[PDB]
Amino acid sequence: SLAEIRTDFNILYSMMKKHEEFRWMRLRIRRMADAWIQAIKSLAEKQNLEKRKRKKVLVHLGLLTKESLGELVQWSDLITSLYLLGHDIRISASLAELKEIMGGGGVELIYIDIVGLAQFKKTLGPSWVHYQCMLRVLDSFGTEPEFNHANYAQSKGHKTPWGKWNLNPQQFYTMFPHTPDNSFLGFVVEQHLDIHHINEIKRQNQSLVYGKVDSFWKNKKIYLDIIHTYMEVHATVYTKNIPSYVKNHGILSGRDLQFLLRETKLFVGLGFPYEGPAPLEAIANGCAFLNPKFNPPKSSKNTDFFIGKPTLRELTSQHPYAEVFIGRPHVWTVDLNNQEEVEDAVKAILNQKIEPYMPYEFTCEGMLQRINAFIEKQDFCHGMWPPLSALQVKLAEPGQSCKQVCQESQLICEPSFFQHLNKDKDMLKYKVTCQSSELAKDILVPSFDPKNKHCVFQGDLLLFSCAGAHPRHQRVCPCRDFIKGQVALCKDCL
Amino acid sequence: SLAEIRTDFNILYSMMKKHEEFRWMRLRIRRMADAWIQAIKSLAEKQNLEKRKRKKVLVHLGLLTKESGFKIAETAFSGGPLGELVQWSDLITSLYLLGHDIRISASLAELKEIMGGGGVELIYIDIVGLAQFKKTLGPSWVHYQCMLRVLDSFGTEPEFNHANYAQSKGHKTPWGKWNLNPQQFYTMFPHTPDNSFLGFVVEQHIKRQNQSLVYGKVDSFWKNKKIYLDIIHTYMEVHATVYTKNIPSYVKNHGILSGRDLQFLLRETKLFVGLGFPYEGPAPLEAIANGCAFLNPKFNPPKSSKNTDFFIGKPTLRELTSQHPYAEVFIGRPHVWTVDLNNQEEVEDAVKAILNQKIEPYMPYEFTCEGMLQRINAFIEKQDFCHMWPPLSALQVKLAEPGQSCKQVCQESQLICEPSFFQHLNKDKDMLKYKVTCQSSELAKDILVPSFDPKNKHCVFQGDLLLFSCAGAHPRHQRVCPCRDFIKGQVALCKDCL
Ligand SMILES: CC(=O)N1CCC[C@](C(=O)O)(c2ccc(C)cc2)C1
């Protein structure tokens, strides 16, 4: 009943069967096996992984069910991580498997997607709610508290089918750390590198466009022409939106793709798809990424793709994580409408020398560290973690969210600490003095009126929210530090 | 001036980096580099490679010229003509390692420039490229005609090569008619002894006993194979690499794989399953080289221009006895089971046998790095159509029965027809030496002669030397047929031809 790390994948391979998607996952794991094994050994050497209880874990991929790319990568990496950490995983990709595993009892943790969660509620019936606190819900784009709370969402006039699960929003697991109301899960970036001679290996004038679908290339000719002034333009398109000068390789194997990326100086974003793995994979191969700037930023308010998504988060660019957490020289964020910004970026990139780069949180060891911490430390099944010693209170100005204020102090909003900031005497300890006070059910409180020292406190604890700016008042905001290149975990959270 | 073997690929990689087309060829060479380097050194140690003249060699790939309408997509092994791309890469590699001075061309402009610049001693070119060569050079193209070596997968038979005879026979193909020495055509497999076999190298770098993998990347190849596949599926999982509605739902698709990933899938696979199409090509040999058995659809009756649209217009009447005749005849059981798909019993017994077989990776010597180096080096040093070889000492005359070709009669003696010797068999005096006495004789311009009527001791001799032909059966008479031995696993070369 204690967990032991695994260092061989044969059992994993036998458990991942009967779906095309798992065939693809098995191949990526085989490519990545040596990296994985080194990382689990390296982690266990640096950090105490003794005396962990072996958990029985349901992994339900609603995505692969009949009754129902980055999601499949994340699933694979989560499964791999759980297996290496020594947990007892029950993989389900059908209603029948879901029924049996749950019907068998002793499940202690449930990893599931949004489509799988509807299936869980239906299959289990009313008692699904008895397992609520064990759910970890892979949800790429994130769910904000305002949408997660079914009655509040309705009260706010939201007309989406999504959200309304009434979970602790930290139970939503996201693709990138864009939504501090949620937990960041992420994935691992594949890299097969060479890393010294990379500038010799690279064909200095070779660009590769990101975008397998012809429709994504609609209206990018001028942009591409600028790029083509300095660089060959290559593509992998499965073609009447593609300029005649494009060297279209079509569908390439993973191994042929890796070769092409090895030789590529610049991976070119068109604007869509949003926030995938592929720009990080190019950067991991020493490519620069030209990242379309979205001014105005894209959200449910102006973009069809985002209408109905249970979040008001806005995207500042095609890949905001790349833009903000990586930046130059690897990533050049440019407005496609500004021909001069594009041109200068391309010229700079041509004259740059860059090394393969991967943020630590997207390596094997990084992901193992993160998910191990969540498994060992995150518990929503009691009345904890992160430790209160990590709390640093900041005051957001009007029109500024708790998300924003923590960010600009080089911190991150930590929603589990809202509870510690929700009454007069607790405020005093953080240099915040309440003259007058009152309770409201709103995502925007706890709030502070600095004119007349008035404190408004949260009266529906499910509505605590990093997201959201007070139009008039200041917000009192819970922040925490993070381990560098590992934003999911405070310094004292291992 | 003398050739030196090369043991490093940096110059080759620089040359090939000059055209986008060569990208995938560079990758295949990198995977295969160590094998190639060992083979060139091994050959030079076993066999005398000193004192070879370094040659200036044009390599013109008509296939890759914009004007032929090819696409960059088709330059990848996974999206293009597997055989042709592989062969070009392996020929270039071989020439580089042997120390020759290679001038690669993939455009009209480059062809014009390299030939426009004098000095070429040997020309490797495809059929599309040959039409291009004639225009770029003008009438003096004939001055280089003897230096041509024409990569032509499926082969050109003398009957089609001879433009006026072809027309006299009513053939309406646009192909053939080059009036070359037919040994100047270089084929993918040794199916056409009127031509030379060039071939290629099979790359080679756990096994699930009940795993079969179907050969056929496109849905259309799977049309009407359900009963065949169902039989296979009775004993084995059926996997695919397809990149949908002809494929049974039990099939386990892996999608597009290449490199180490495809090799891994093959190493794991017990049986590689042929559907009937495509014909020949490298893929079955690559599976066999990774320890897979190959289920090889038998064509009864054999496929040719007479019954199959694909073969119409091809400058040859060669028939295919199976999807992969080389695999059938030159490899055979236990690695290759040749079965009629329409015969449920044959298929089932094959599949059961294969399940219970234990077999090793296998590759005939001619498809190894060292084998191909040996072959192409011999051609370069010994084959000359300009100014003998093979030596006359290798000639063994046989008499083909009526309805039997010179190709066939040599084959059944474990020999191969050797067209350069026909000239030594073409008049009364020369016949006597081979137990053939001519009472009466006459000359005819026919692919089928020299012929012998044994009833009335009548000899018909060849009056157009360009019509000598291994291919072709006399419906009435016997043929006098030139045969030669070969080095084992190396059918291109007689025992005394190194
Ligand atoms: C990488 C490659 O050359 N590929 C991708 C898989 C499909 C392919 C074909 O069918 O021609 C093929 C070739 C060879 C074998 C043994 C199996 C499959 C082509």
PDB file of N, CA and C in Angstrom, chain B residues 176-205:
ATOM      1  N   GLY B 176       9.230   4.171 -74.607  1.00  0.00           N
ATOM      2  CA  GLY B 176      10.171   3.443 -75.442  1.00  0.00           C
ATOM      3  C   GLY B 176      10.637   4.359 -76.572  1.00  0.00           C
ATOM      4  N   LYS B 177      11.038   3.718 -77.666  1.00  0.00           N
ATOM      5  CA  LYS B 177      11.456   4.369 -78.896  1.00  0.00           C
ATOM      6  C   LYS B 177      12.763   5.132 -78.761  1.00  0.00           C
ATOM      7  N   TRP B 178      13.582   4.903 -77.701  1.00  0.00           N
ATOM      8  CA  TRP B 178      14.831   5.637 -77.597  1.00  0.00           C
ATOM      9  C   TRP B 178      15.981   5.051 -78.424  1.00  0.00           C
ATOM     10  N   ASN B 179      15.812   3.834 -78.980  1.00  0.00           N
ATOM     11  CA  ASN B 179      16.839   3.155 -79.759  1.00  0.00           C
ATOM     12  C   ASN B 179      18.166   3.065 -78.982  1.00  0.00           C
ATOM     13  N   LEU B 180      18.131   2.820 -77.655  1.00  0.00           N
ATOM     14  CA  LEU B 180      19.349   2.616 -76.866  1.00  0.00           C
ATOM     15  C   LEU B 180      19.776   1.151 -76.941  1.00  0.00           C
ATOM     16  N   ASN B 181      20.955   0.842 -76.391  1.00  0.00           N
ATOM     17  CA  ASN B 181      21.260  -0.540 -76.068  1.00  0.00           C
ATOM     18  C   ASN B 181      20.410  -0.878 -74.864  1.00  0.00           C
ATOM     19  N   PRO B 182      19.522  -1.895 -74.897  1.00  0.00           N
ATOM     20  CA  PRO B 182      18.555  -2.043 -73.819  1.00  0.00           C
ATOM     21  C   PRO B 182      19.199  -2.320 -72.455  1.00  0.00           C
ATOM     22  N   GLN B 183      20.482  -2.681 -72.417  1.00  0.00           N
ATOM     23  CA  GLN B 183      21.175  -2.826 -71.143  1.00  0.00           C
ATOM     24  C   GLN B 183      21.453  -1.477 -70.493  1.00  0.00           C
ATOM     25  N   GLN B 184      21.197  -0.374 -71.203  1.00  0.00           N
ATOM     26  CA  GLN B 184      21.345   0.957 -70.618  1.00  0.00           C
ATOM     27  C   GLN B 184      20.149   1.312 -69.726  1.00  0.00           C
ATOM     28  N   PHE B 185      19.016   0.569 -69.825  1.00  0.00           N
ATOM     29  CA  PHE B 185      17.909   0.742 -68.873  1.00  0.00           C
ATOM     30  C   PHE B 185      18.205  -0.002 -67.565  1.00  0.00           C
ATOM     31  N   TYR B 186      18.015   0.709 -66.435  1.00  0.00           N
ATOM     32  CA  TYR B 186      18.377   0.281 -65.098  1.00  0.00           C
ATOM     33  C   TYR B 186      17.085   0.120 -64.281  1.00  0.00           C
ATOM     34  N   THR B 187      16.783  -1.110 -63.849  1.00  0.00           N
ATOM     35  CA  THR B 187      15.474  -1.456 -63.295  1.00  0.00           C
ATOM     36  C   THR B 187      15.527  -1.566 -61.780  1.00  0.00           C
ATOM     37  N   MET B 188      14.334  -1.675 -61.187  1.00  0.00           N
ATOM     38  CA  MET B 188      14.188  -1.667 -59.734  1.00  0.00           C
ATOM     39  C   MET B 188      14.438  -3.050 -59.161  1.00  0.00           C
ATOM     40  N   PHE B 189      14.073  -4.065 -59.935  1.00  0.00           N
ATOM     41  CA  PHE B 189      14.229  -5.462 -59.584  1.00  0.00           C
ATOM     42  C   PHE B 189      14.738  -6.175 -60.824  1.00  0.00           C
ATOM     43  N   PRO B 190      15.382  -7.353 -60.667  1.00  0.00           N
ATOM     44  CA  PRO B 190      15.940  -8.067 -61.823  1.00  0.00           C
ATOM     45  C   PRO B 190      14.861  -8.879 -62.520  1.00  0.00           C
ATOM     46  N   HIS B 191      13.878  -8.174 -63.105  1.00  0.00           N
ATOM     47  CA  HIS B 191      12.736  -8.813 -63.757  1.00  0.00           C
ATOM     48  C   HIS B 191      12.923  -8.827 -65.276  1.00  0.00           C
ATOM     49  N   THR B 192      13.909  -8.073 -65.787  1.00  0.00           N
ATOM     50  CA  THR B 192      14.012  -7.845 -67.224  1.00  0.00           C
ATOM     51  C   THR B 192      15.457  -7.967 -67.660  1.00  0.00           C
ATOM     52  N   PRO B 193      15.946  -9.180 -68.011  1.00  0.00           N
ATOM     53  CA  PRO B 193      17.363  -9.384 -68.288  1.00  0.00           C
ATOM     54  C   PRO B 193      17.828  -8.674 -69.552  1.00  0.00           C
ATOM     55  N   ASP B 194      16.887  -8.187 -70.398  1.00  0.00           N
ATOM     56  CA  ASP B 194      17.301  -7.316 -71.487  1.00  0.00           C
ATOM     57  C   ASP B 194      17.900  -6.013 -70.949  1.00  0.00           C
ATOM     58  N   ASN B 195      17.573  -5.678 -69.697  1.00  0.00           N
ATOM     59  CA  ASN B 195      17.999  -4.441 -69.061  1.00  0.00           C
ATOM     60  C   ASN B 195      19.002  -4.796 -67.948  1.00  0.00           C
ATOM     61  N   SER B 196      19.566  -3.784 -67.288  1.00  0.00           N
ATOM     62  CA  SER B 196      20.405  -4.022 -66.140  1.00  0.00           C
ATOM     63  C   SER B 196      19.582  -3.830 -64.870  1.00  0.00           C
ATOM     64  N   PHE B 197      19.893  -4.624 -63.845  1.00  0.00           N
ATOM     65  CA  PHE B 197      19.273  -4.410 -62.541  1.00  0.00           C
ATOM     66  C   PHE B 197      20.086  -3.415 -61.711  1.00  0.00           C
ATOM     67  N   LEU B 198      19.483  -2.265 -61.339  1.00  0.00           N
ATOM     68  CA  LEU B 198      20.135  -1.326 -60.433  1.00  0.00           C
ATOM     69  C   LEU B 198      19.707  -1.595 -58.989  1.00  0.00           C
ATOM     70  N   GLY B 199      18.407  -1.625 -58.738  1.00  0.00           N
ATOM     71  CA  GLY B 199      17.860  -1.826 -57.395  1.00  0.00           C
ATOM     72  C   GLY B 199      18.132  -0.667 -56.444  1.00  0.00           C
ATOM     73  N   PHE B 200      18.379  -1.034 -55.175  1.00  0.00           N
ATOM     74  CA  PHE B 200      18.447  -0.103 -54.065  1.00  0.00           C
ATOM     75  C   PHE B 200      18.891  -0.882 -52.829  1.00  0.00           C
ATOM     76  N   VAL B 201      18.929  -0.195 -51.682  1.00  0.00           N
ATOM     77  CA  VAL B 201      19.272  -0.864 -50.454  1.00  0.00           C
ATOM     78  C   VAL B 201      18.053  -0.909 -49.530  1.00  0.00           C
ATOM     79  N   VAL B 202      17.859  -2.051 -48.894  1.00  0.00           N
ATOM     80  CA  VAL B 202      16.838  -2.179 -47.884  1.00  0.00           C
ATOM     81  C   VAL B 202      17.404  -1.800 -46.525  1.00  0.00           C
ATOM     82  N   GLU B 203      16.790  -0.778 -45.902  1.00  0.00           N
ATOM     83  CA  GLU B 203      17.234  -0.309 -44.605  1.00  0.00           C
ATOM     84  C   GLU B 203      16.916  -1.365 -43.551  1.00  0.00           C
ATOM     85  N   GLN B 204      17.872  -1.611 -42.649  1.00  0.00           N
ATOM     86  CA  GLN B 204      17.675  -2.552 -41.552  1.00  0.00           C
ATOM     87  C   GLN B 204      18.421  -2.037 -40.326  1.00  0.00           C
ATOM     88  N   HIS B 205      17.735  -2.025 -39.174  1.00  0.00           N
ATOM     89  CA  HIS B 205      18.302  -1.490 -37.945  1.00  0.00           C
ATOM     90  C   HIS B 205      18.064  -2.466 -36.787  1.00  0.00           C
TER      91      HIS B 205
END
